[PDB]
C-alpha cells in the first residue's frame, strides 16, 4: 500500500539523519510526505523530523512551518506528548527568529504538558529551553560594558528569570543523572551571569561546564569554557589570568 512505502521512506530518512547526512534525509522525508499515509501519528512524526532537519540546516522559516503543522496535528489527534514536543520545537525556532514573546508561550506549553504527564525528562528540557529564551530576550537589548552598569528592571527581570530556569533545570537533571544536560545549562547559566554582572558567579558556572566538557572528551565545549572564563576575569580586572585562559583557548582549537 501507500502506507508501507511512506513508512519505508521515513525509516530510511531517520537512519540518514541519525547517521550524519540530514540533507538527504530531508529528501526522503519530503518524499514520504509526497507518498503520504492515513496514519497521522506517522505523518506528525515525519513533519517533526523535517522541522529539526531544517532547523539544523539554518532554514529556520521552514522549521517553524513544519513544527507548526506538527503542533496542529498533535492537537488534532489528541497526542499530548506530541503537542508538548511540537510546542518545544516551535518555541525554540521562534527564539532563533527573535519572536521571544510567542516563543515563551510555546516553551511554556511544553513545560505545562510535561508537568501534567509527569514527564521529568521533558520537564527539564523545557526548563532549559525557557532559560535560553529569556536569556536571548534580555541579551537582545541594545548591545551586550555600559550594559552591565546600567539597564532597565524589565531586562534584569528577563535575565534573572533565565537564571531561575537554568537552576531549576539543573536541579532536575541532577536527579536524572544527565551530565550532558548539566553541561549545557551550566554554560548558558554562566553567560547569563556574565551579562547580569555576576562575574564570580559566572566563573563557577563555566568551571563546571569545563569539567563536564573534559569528562566527555569534548573539545568544542572545552574551547568555549576557556573562552567564556577569559571574559569574566577581564571584568574582575584579572588580565594576566584572562590572558592565559585566552591562550588556552587559542592553544586548544589548534590541537
Amino acid at each position: 500500500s501507500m502506507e508501507a512505502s511512506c513508512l519505508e521512506l521515513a525509516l530510511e530518512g531517520e537512519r540518514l539523519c541519525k547517521s550524519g547526512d540530514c540533507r538527504a534525509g530531508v529528501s526522503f522525508f519530503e518524499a514520504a510526505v509526497q507518498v503520504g499515509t492515513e496514519d497521522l501519528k506517522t505523518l506528525s512524526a515525519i513533519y517533526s523530523q523535517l522541522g529539526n532537519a531544517y532547523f539544523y540546516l539554518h532554514d529556520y522559516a521552514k522549521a517553524l512551518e513544519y513544527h507548526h503543522h506538527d503542533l496542529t496535528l498533535a492537537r488534532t489527534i489528541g497526542d499530548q506528548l506530541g503537542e508538548a514536543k511540537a510546542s518545544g520545537n516551535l518555541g525554540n525556532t521562534l527564539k532563533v527568529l527573535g519572536n521571544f514573546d510567542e516563543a515563551i508561550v510555546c516553551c511554556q506549553r511544553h513545560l505545562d504538558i510535561s508537568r501534567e504527564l509527569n514527564d521529568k525528562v521533558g520537564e527539564a528540557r523545557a526548563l532549559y529551553n525557557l532559560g535560553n529564551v529569556y536569556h536571548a530576550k534580555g541579551k537582545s537589548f541594545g548591545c551586550p560594558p555600559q550594559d552591565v552598569g546600567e539597564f532597565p528592571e524589565e531586562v534584569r527581570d528577563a535575565l534573572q528569570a533565565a537564571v531561575d530556569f537554568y537552576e531549576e533545570n539543573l536541579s532536575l537533571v541532577t536527579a536524572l543523572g544527565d551530565r550532558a544536560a548539566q553541561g549545557r545549562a551550566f554554560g548558558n547559566l554562566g553567560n547569563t551571569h556574565y551579562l547580569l554582572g555576576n562575574f564570580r558567579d559566572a566563573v563557577i558556572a563555566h568551571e563546571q561546564r569545563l569539567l563536564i566538557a573534559k569528562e566527555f572528551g569534548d573539545k568544542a565545549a572545552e574551547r568555549r569554557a576557556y573562552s567564556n572564563l577569559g571574559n569574566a576575569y577581564i571584568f574582575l580586572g584579572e588580565f594576566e589570568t584572562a590572558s592565559e585562559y585566552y591562550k588556552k583557548t587559542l592553544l586548544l582549537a589548534r590541537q
Binding site: 532547523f55 532563533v96 532549559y128 545549562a185 548558558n188 553567560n191
Partner: peptide, 18 residues
C-alpha cells in the same frame, strides 16, 4: 561576543509505532 551552548530539540520517530 559570548559563546553559547546548542539547543535541544525534542524528537519524534516513526519507530514509535513499534
Amino acid at each position: 561576543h559570548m559563546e553559547m551552548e546548542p539547543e535541544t530539540m525534542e524528537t519524534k520517530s516513526v519507530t514509535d509505532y513499534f
